[PDB]
Amino acid sequence: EETTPQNMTCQEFMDMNPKSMTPVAFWVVNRNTDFSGGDYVDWHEVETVSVPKMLQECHKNPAAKLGDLSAVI
Amino acid sequence: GVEETTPQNMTCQEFMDMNPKSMTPVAFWVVNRNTDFSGGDYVDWHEVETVSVPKMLQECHKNPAAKLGDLSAVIKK
């Protein structure tokens, strides 16, 4: 049914195929942007900064939903 | 390297078997991984969810051994 991670838990993110981590993280941080004027987190930044940050936050609260984590970063 | 946290070497079988909740994000990567985001030349989130995802599932059913790193052109077409 739902094909976006709004209701995916932090536990699920930690346990996923790592090959989907950068894409899922990109959604968390860029779901609401138009990518205009460089006002987005680029793929490199997501890979090198957002993914580790998400893993850090998800270790603190595995029951958190990813749809609520755009704000915490 | 960072490649291992992207779907370049993910197979179509793996995509079909994934949590559906990761499908839109993964599809967004397939179509927008090297795109000119500044001139609006990208496939937006709504289009990826409603068009790219079903298109990817269709293509992946035809060839489960295909790698997603090779599917950008066919999903964008």
Work out the strand percent of chain A.
Answer: under 5%
What is the domain total for the residues of chain A? 1
Total DSSP E strands of chain A = 0
Report the order of strands and helices of chain A. Answer: HHH
By secondary-structure content and strand pairing, the structural class of chain A works out as mainly alpha
Biggest chain contact: A-B, 33 and 28 residues
CATH superfamily of chain A: HNS-dependent expression A
Radius of gyration of chain A (CA) equals 12 Å
CATH architecture title of chain A = Orthogonal Bundle
Our count of helices of chain A gives: 3
What CATH calls the topology of chain A is 10k-s Protein, Hypothetical Protein A, Chain A
CATH class of chain A: Mainly Alpha
Largest sheet of chain A: none
How far is the N terminus from the C terminus of chain A? 27 Å
Shape call of chain A: globular
Portion in helices of chain A? 40-55%
Quaternary organization: homodimer
Topology:
Two copies of one chain form a homodimer.
Chain A: H1 10-15, H2 21-30, H3 43-60
PDB class: chaperone
Keywords: HdeA family protein (PF06411), protein HNS-dependent expression A fold, Structural Genomics, Joint Center for Structural Genomics, jcsg, Protein Structure Initiative, PSI-biology, chaperone
Assembly: dimeric
Task: Describe the overall structure.
The structure is a homodimer. Chain A has 73 residues and is mostly helical. Chain A is built from three helices and no strands. In chain A, helix 2 (21-30) crosses helix 3. At the A-B interface, helix 2 and helix 3 of A face helix 2 and helix 3 of B. Chain A: Keywords: Chaperone, Periplasm, Signal.
